[PDB]
Amino acid sequence: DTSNQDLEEKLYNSILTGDYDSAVRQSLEYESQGKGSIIQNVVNNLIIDKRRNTMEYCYKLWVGNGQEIVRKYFPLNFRLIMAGNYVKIIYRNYNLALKLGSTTNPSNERIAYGDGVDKHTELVSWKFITLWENNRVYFKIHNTKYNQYLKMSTTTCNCNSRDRVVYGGNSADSTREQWFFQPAKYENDVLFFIYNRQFNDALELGTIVNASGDRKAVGHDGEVAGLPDIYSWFITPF
């Protein structure tokens, strides 16, 4: 009886309010009834609205018998993220792939960069590991070559004068070693803003550091969601 439009509204509301168990139940029911278009429409609208809760919805489907729904109705990159596939993480603005540098500091940590050239070797391979906590999905961003996790400094102050350099470290148990994503649609692509769980700073590429055109990776100070052309990332298969 209830129209597909009204069910879309109910589903969107569930997701926005963080009632993921209702969202998953609804989604399974709609797909079983051949009304999967409801899910497609909600995913489209969530992304147009740049809702971070899209990630949670995807995750909860992924672990809640909804893997086929994820495959069918979300862009490919969502499955790459939830399935833990090897990926490249490429900055939209400069088209540079994320890597870690070759030297370690006394804390045994590497500095993160966008590579000026490389889009192919193991140097730019990553995978994501999910963590569900506080009714939210977070990501540990794991570097294949060096077996380290993307992070911000775990020794710096929790204050406005913090170190904003992005590093790689051996573990990912701290909120500073964890990240959350916000999707956005720009031109034909679904891209992601990637934010540090503890600091809320968006992952950004700053100034050029060498002749090959590498750029430093840093945490941005301020809102970025209006500018996916400047501050978002592509996630593509490695």
Numbering used by the authors: 8 to 245
From the paper:
The 30-kDa LPs are involved in many physiological processes in the silkworm body.
Here we present the crystal structure of Bombyx mori lipoprotein 6 (Bmlp6). The N-terminal domain (NTD) of Bmlp6 (residues 1-91) consists of six helices forming a right-handed superhelix and packed in a globular form. The interactions between the monomers in the crystal lattice are weak with no indication of possible quaternary structure, as established by the PISA server. Specifically, molecules of MES, isopropanol and fragments of PEG were mainly located at the protein surface. There are only two potential cavities in Bmlp6, denoted Po.1 and Po.2, in contrast to Bmlp3 and Bmlp7, where three cavities (No. 1–3) are present. The structure demonstrates that Bmlp6 differs from Bmlp3 and Bmlp7 in the conformation of loops, the electrostatic surface potential, and potential binding cavities.
